Ligand binder design. Structure first.
Ligand SMILES: *C(#N)C1=NC2=C(N=[C]N2[C]2[C][C][C][C]2)C([N]C2=[C][C]=[C][C]=C2O[C][C][C]N2[C][C]N([C])[C][C]2)=N1
Length: 216
């Protein structure tokens, strides 16, 4: 049975919150966060991986203009690795795809998608695999200015996916079930960079519509 609560921050599987800056590279940050968890699970080391490597190199995505996490996991697998943040730092604008003869920090062997709209399957994946990359509708002012509590807004549109984040756990606060979400808008956004989003409230904000995790 998947546990009632899981918080990967408490287990040391989650790196510090980053800021994507003036670039719409959320998909890159969501992707490396998931790879960071699997690297930790597999090797015992927690390390910042490189979202810039993905922005500059995943030709199938649109750089600072948006992209898909699956395309990023596919690139890491075909390219035989992703560099660390230290070897390929984030600059927040698209540039040429650079090759670092010794930058390789993690590999990926593929990915799996969570069945569309199934929060129970998402819960199980988080519990057994670790942090999972998810997409949501982040267009509401109530989301943008979130500060605390379990977020739920009836206006959220589960078919309007416009932002990529990372699910690092789930739980319940004052009787309300939630997902623990790591964002990439810096530590000053939300609650130290995180937001608790309603869980089992009918796929609120489309949280379970485009979820995936990398195989390592
Ligand atoms: C993040 N950050 C992020 N930024 C986005 C996204 N769509 C547009 N933007 C920017 C807003 C200012 C201009 C660019 C997304 N979208 C997103 C989130 C999660 C999963 C998928 C996804 O969209 C992937 C396709 C994006 N696509 C690019 C090409 N245009 C023509 C249509 C939209 N995230």
């Amino acid at each position: 049975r998947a546990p009632d609560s899981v918080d990967y921050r408490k287990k040391g599987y989650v790196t510090p919150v980053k800021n994507q800056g003036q670039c719409g590279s959320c998909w890159a940050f969501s992707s490396v966060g998931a790879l960071e968890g699997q690297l930790k699970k597999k090797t015992g080391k927690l390390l910042n991986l490189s979202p810039q490597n993905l922005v500059d190199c995943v030709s199938e995505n649109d750089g600072c203009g948006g992209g898909y996490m699956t395309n990023a996991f596919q690139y890491v697998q075909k390219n035989r690795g992703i560099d660390s943040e230290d070897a390929y730092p984030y600059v927040g604008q698209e540039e040429s795809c650079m090759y670092n003869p010794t930058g390789k920090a993690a590999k990926c062997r593929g990915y799996r998608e969570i069945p569309e709209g199934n929060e129970k399957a998402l819960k199980r994946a988080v519990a057994r695999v670790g942090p999972v990359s998810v997409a949501i509708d982040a267009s509401l002012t109530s989301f943008q200015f979130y500060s605390k509590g379990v977020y739920y807004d009836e206006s959220c549109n589960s078919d309007n996916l416009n932002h990529a984040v990372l699910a690092v756990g789930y739980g319940i606060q004052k009787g309300n079930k939630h997902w623990i979400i790591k964002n990439s808008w810096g530590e000053n956004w939300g609650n130290k960079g995180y937001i608790l989003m309603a869980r089992n409230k009918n796929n609120a904000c489309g949280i379970a519509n485009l979820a995936s995790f990398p195989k390592m």
